[PDB]
RNA sequence: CGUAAAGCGCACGCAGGCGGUUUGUUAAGUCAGAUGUGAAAUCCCCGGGCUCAACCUGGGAACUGCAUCUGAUACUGGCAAGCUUGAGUCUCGUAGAGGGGGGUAGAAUUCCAGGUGUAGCGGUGAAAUGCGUAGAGAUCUGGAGGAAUACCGGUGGCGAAGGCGGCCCCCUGGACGAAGACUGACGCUCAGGUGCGAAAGCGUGGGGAGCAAACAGGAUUAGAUACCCUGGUAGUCCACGCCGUAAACGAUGUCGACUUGGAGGUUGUGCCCUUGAGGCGUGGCUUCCGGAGCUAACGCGUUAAGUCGACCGCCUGGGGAGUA
């Protein structure tokens, strides 16, 4: 009657829009899809990756209750935005309590600064803070035992864009984005940003209080063109990214992501690039002037036809080595620019 | 363009009061004061066709109001065209 | 009453304007179906189901929806009724004259492959004839035991299986569907304004229909006769 | 009457046509009856006579009308008195490449004078004609003159249409909305008429950077009165007159009413927690997609090509011909 009308305003009263009221009971689990029912229209297609805690395995069976989020309705069929963000609000509440407490005490362990402030991780999540926040004074946790246990004492938070730098060790001690866009600027300030949508040319990681970043396709990895960003990173995930460029007009901060496994390649050039170190490597495709061993984490094109034996020109590597086989090959040159290591195979015992 | 003191002067001069602003003698008097004002603007400038179309518009508006007033009350029609000064 | 499943209302803005009798625009720019008018229409549907199933008639259950897939098989094999849940073939009812011998291929092929030449020719031939059986099995499996034209069609989404409705309106089958807010209640005889995309809802509506069917087929008159 | 033939290029506007709503009067239109008349023959009906029929003929009906008298007064019209919804006026603002006149700014192109400097420049699909050792092209400084206003620039804005883009001033038209007041049908359309009307062109007087018909030359080609290149005069610009046409196009006359939705743009405004770029409504103009309905289909679809009403323009096979 008005039973139903009253019933409706009752059910309005006993739900809210965000991920606040822990209401969805997990009513089917299957890898790789969780699904709940928080009194909304449909049932969420939950990833498994919003629900495994800190070492990789699941924590919640049938009947268990986490709130999710809302304010977005119907993309065709379905209901939600993920409950993991839910969690962010809880983290915010604890941070507020510390600010509110006047302080917040947990554990903060910060080994190093991607962009000038040690990284602090609380429970599952890891956050990035400005450089001062990690240490109370000039103590520096580089001399501390690695990934040490303290808490976090807050140094600085940016209040809009979420960057929090927190205080390790020293227990005793106790319009809007675009005018002053010089904070994360200067050349390469690393950031932790969640990606939003990957537009087949891009990835759109954008976190720092109402901005837009791209990390488009050219860097992303250490392969250029065949990459397809959906395969290589994620959807909705907080990553390694830094600015590389901010354009004042046109409002296009052009971030990057290759500032990572670039270092691995450098190590390969070095690590085994000290002089003439020997390597056990597997060939992948012999292209009539070489053999292309490509073991050791993405180091590209290698041994030329000129060595291969103690005969120069007549050899044709398909006749002499193999397809897909691990061999003797030592380094002989790493060229830092133009990304050419040039291994060899004549360094053996025939003469 | 026919400032507010001029319009209040003509409303109070031809109407009943400062509220009877929409009667026929008042509307004819405001259109006539406007036309006789714009004759100085079309004395020079000679080519403002987009404004002269507004002039011809309020000329025909004045003529249809005078045709209504001549049809209803010939007494105030003669008092208005003789008080105001028109008819070729 | 939102009894146990949550069947309150739907999508946002692309409502079919023919369903102006069932709307309440909520604060989140989402429609609320009039739940105090849903229940008389649903009872007017079940009062037809007891009649045409106590006719000993055949109900055909239709819903794919990627989520109401198993609720139709589970909630329809509990009765003696028939279902289509994976893929709706174009012309299973009005071109049933040629769907018939495809059913003969399914029954006449699992007859050969439960005991007969399911190994006698080639491992590749088992990989062909078996794959044929798993292709026809979740395409004709629920309609396999029907052997006739159905007397009713219970559609769970008019907007998703609108060609099954027009299909069984070329011929004279009384269809009825639970419609969404964006669905079209034109071919549907006994419209049920509610939730199409909730697993709770396709448990609730389809479960109460399942109660009216097997509870409706006289277990009392027969007993008396005995 | 969007594309088949067919919506004036767009307006104003006299005669003409049409007209919101209430009351009273009139009875002109309208309706009803009656009388006179509407010749006879002919048509039609029911009969009769020629042996039947054709034919002749009795009686009627009809002669769709006109005039007069008597009434009816719902509608239309005439007259009188109103009413406010249609229309119009006033008080506040609001946005806008709306128009006319005047002034000014920066970049660039061209030329001229000077400096540095020397062997090419320019151009093409390739080339040549052309310019350059008389110092070109480039680079710098200065000056002159003309024209158009990058970015903003927005299936954005304003205008009846044509159309209107730097910035500032002066004179000036229209639209819109909120709250009231005022007049009281003053309204819509409009043959003839009058006005405005891109570009080209014509006349008079100026001005002439860049571009560019004609024209010259080089190519291309079988030919090339062309496309391409190098030059280059009318014209493009201004002031005053004329011309009065355009694929003047939404190929859709104007005005008014009604009839499911969605996504946007732009421009006002009201309320509330402006407490946050917030939420709910409300007017105007406009873009797209689609519903019924319509259409030969394509498509149109609340800004209709849907349902209707008022008035106007136009069409009646193709060519001859929008020609004589």
XYZ file of C-alpha atoms (C1' of nucleotides) in Angstrom, chain D residues 22-182:
161
model
C -19.592 36.807 -23.372
C -24.332 39.298 -23.445
C -28.334 41.904 -25.872
C -30.778 43.373 -30.586
C -31.421 42.473 -35.953
C -32.926 38.313 -39.395
C -29.046 39.926 -44.302
C -26.759 34.773 -45.157
C -29.010 30.012 -43.192
C -33.331 26.808 -42.143
C -38.931 25.579 -42.431
C -43.805 26.384 -44.529
C -47.094 28.666 -48.037
C -48.333 31.229 -52.662
C -47.190 32.672 -57.668
C -44.018 31.143 -61.472
C -40.388 27.797 -63.554
C -44.714 26.896 -71.395
C -45.804 22.446 -74.116
C -42.906 18.637 -75.996
C -38.253 15.750 -73.785
C -36.052 12.580 -69.215
C -38.392 9.276 -64.969
C -42.806 6.430 -62.584
C -47.919 3.932 -62.987
C -51.291 2.964 -66.893
C -53.744 2.746 -72.038
C -53.531 2.052 -77.582
C -51.194 0.292 -82.148
C -50.808 -8.165 -83.300
C -45.417 -6.846 -80.007
C -41.714 -3.309 -80.041
C -40.013 1.371 -81.948
C -44.023 5.101 -81.852
C -48.373 7.774 -79.837
C -50.808 9.127 -75.399
C -53.650 9.822 -69.929
C -52.260 11.061 -64.969
C -48.293 12.279 -61.907
C -43.346 13.194 -60.397
C -39.568 16.438 -61.615
C -38.303 21.209 -63.792
C -31.987 20.900 -58.973
C -34.477 27.682 -59.614
C -36.420 32.955 -58.769
C -39.598 36.409 -56.266
C -42.911 37.533 -52.048
C -45.230 36.652 -47.041
C -44.969 34.166 -42.474
C -42.036 32.347 -38.717
C -36.668 29.757 -36.097
C -32.278 32.274 -34.237
C -27.830 27.266 -33.121
C -24.011 29.053 -36.563
C -22.044 33.285 -40.056
C -22.616 38.473 -40.881
C -24.418 43.846 -39.331
C -25.041 47.100 -34.616
C -24.341 48.270 -29.239
C -21.804 47.050 -24.629
C -18.100 44.295 -22.720
C -13.765 40.297 -21.271
C -8.446 38.863 -21.520
C -5.836 34.129 -23.173
C -4.397 36.452 -29.174
C -1.773 41.040 -30.317
C 0.684 45.506 -28.470
C 2.941 49.277 -24.656
C 5.885 50.531 -20.130
C 9.772 49.616 -15.613
C 14.692 46.346 -15.018
C 18.356 43.802 -17.112
C 20.866 39.921 -20.685
C 23.879 38.195 -24.738
C 25.150 38.978 -29.813
C 30.732 38.891 -36.692
C 22.805 43.016 -36.577
C 23.545 47.901 -39.543
C 25.817 53.101 -40.852
C 29.830 56.530 -40.026
C 34.853 57.653 -37.906
C 39.547 56.170 -35.910
C 43.538 52.936 -34.666
C 46.901 48.290 -33.759
C 50.086 43.960 -34.978
C 51.861 40.083 -38.165
C 52.706 39.155 -43.209
C 53.157 40.190 -48.843
C 55.151 43.738 -52.463
C 58.345 47.907 -53.664
C 62.146 51.622 -52.757
C 66.947 53.415 -50.422
C 71.223 51.534 -47.772
C 74.629 47.529 -45.453
C 76.933 42.427 -45.417
C 77.746 38.684 -49.019
C 78.366 35.529 -53.968
C 76.672 31.988 -57.527
C 72.828 30.746 -58.131
C 67.422 31.567 -57.373
C 62.606 30.153 -58.746
C 59.464 26.140 -60.404
C 57.642 21.010 -61.538
C 55.188 14.649 -61.879
C 60.016 15.871 -64.580
C 61.433 20.371 -67.090
C 61.874 24.901 -69.541
C 60.098 30.068 -70.121
C 61.625 33.820 -66.101
C 64.996 36.550 -62.590
C 70.711 36.899 -61.358
C 77.908 38.737 -61.839
C 74.643 45.452 -64.275
C 75.330 41.607 -57.658
C 70.114 38.275 -57.660
C 68.100 34.519 -53.741
C 69.319 35.028 -48.376
C 70.199 38.445 -43.915
C 69.730 43.266 -41.320
C 68.040 48.630 -40.717
C 64.636 52.367 -42.311
C 60.488 54.103 -45.158
C 56.004 53.980 -48.305
C 51.249 51.952 -49.749
C 47.176 48.743 -50.118
C 44.278 44.805 -48.493
C 42.614 41.090 -45.041
C 41.908 40.602 -39.795
C 45.990 34.137 -37.209
C 44.966 32.395 -32.313
C 39.950 33.055 -29.737
C 36.453 29.872 -33.458
C 32.857 26.989 -31.015
C 27.269 21.226 -37.078
C 28.807 28.754 -31.687
C 26.136 33.976 -32.339
C 23.082 37.920 -34.729
C 20.047 39.209 -38.981
C 13.563 38.833 -43.014
C 16.711 37.012 -46.628
C 21.340 38.358 -49.050
C 24.885 38.241 -45.205
C 27.915 39.906 -40.959
C 34.775 37.974 -37.617
C 41.278 42.635 -35.041
C 40.308 46.614 -31.353
C 37.903 51.451 -29.820
C 34.226 55.517 -30.211
C 29.513 57.849 -32.029
C 24.452 57.129 -34.066
C 20.918 53.111 -34.347
C 17.401 48.235 -35.328
C 15.695 43.632 -33.421
C 15.317 39.387 -30.021
C 15.042 37.230 -25.150
C 13.627 36.573 -19.874
C 11.602 37.872 -14.395
C 7.888 40.518 -11.786
C 3.895 43.631 -12.300
C 0.854 47.495 -14.650
C -1.786 49.196 -19.005
